Design a protein around this ligand. Structure first.
Ligand code: HEC
Ligand code: HEC
Lengths: 106, 106
């Protein structure tokens, strides 16, 4: 899937975690976000098409996805400890990363 | 590759980075550390061989490499900006992530 499908998947599962009528939907949703984030990390966004992969901007943009994937993997840890609210609160924390990247690169 | 070979790679290039002399050297050493860190992240560590790949311990273990990769990518931003002393400093702080995962999972 291209970059915007991944972003759509990230968007839809974030909402899933917020309304989780459970405790293992969190895990399920987080797994899909992990998959989407990782896959979106290999894509060059529109506003950096003409730039070098070695360019600081490309590493900065890739760093955002490292941080995001780290935040999800940590929430997957909390959710797999059965800590439903902390994992859901860790998922709220993710929007920092979404918005920091959108502000500079979308 | 096996986890032990990726760890030797991380150890050797961290040492190359500290012996310095140019941001181009740091950049190449960091490129190899990144490739090894991503592969190590796929391994199963001996101390966790008989626990679920979805256990919190395995998620904390994969989290460790998320943090490392993200730190490496930050240090590649600096090396590619030509800031060798800043990039070295950022590469020396990888040892915190090393030590921390070793304290738990080695
Ligand atoms: C960079 C490191 C990003 C992170 C982290 C996140 N997103 Fe993103 N997003 C990014 C780009 C470059 C773009 C635009 C790409 C393009 O092709 O123009 C987007 C776009 C979106 C969208 C719009 C979807 C669409 O138009 O089809 C959404 C809904 C979206 N992003 C959501 C989203 C969420 C919820 C994130 C964190 C949980 C997130 N993104 C992270 C770059 C980056
Ligand atoms: C977990 C998230 C780790 C991170 C991050 C780092 N290391 Fe590691 N290391 C880890 C394990 C589980 C092991 C045991 C390997 C095994 O197969 O049992 C290791 C081992 C090492 C070793 C010595 C073992 C060998 O290579 O034969 C070294 C020298 C080593 N690790 C170095 C190293 C460095 C320099 C790291 C970052 C700067 C680092 N490791 C990160 C787990 C994890």
């Amino acid at each position: 899937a291209d970059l915007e499908d991944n972003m759509e998947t990230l968007n839809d599962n974030l909402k899933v975690i917020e309304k989780a009528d459970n405790a293992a939907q969190v895990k399920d949703a987080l797994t899909k976000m992990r998959a989407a984030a990782l896959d979106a990390q290999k894509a060059t966004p529109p506003k950096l098409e003409d730039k070098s992969p070695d360019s600081p901007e490309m590493w900065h943009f890739r760093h955002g996805f490292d941080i995001l994937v780290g935040i999800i993997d940590d929430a997957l840890k909390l959710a797999n400890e059965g800590k439903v609210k902390e994992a859901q609160a860790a998922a709220e924390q993710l929007k920092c990363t979404c918005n920091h990247c959108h502000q500079h690169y979308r």
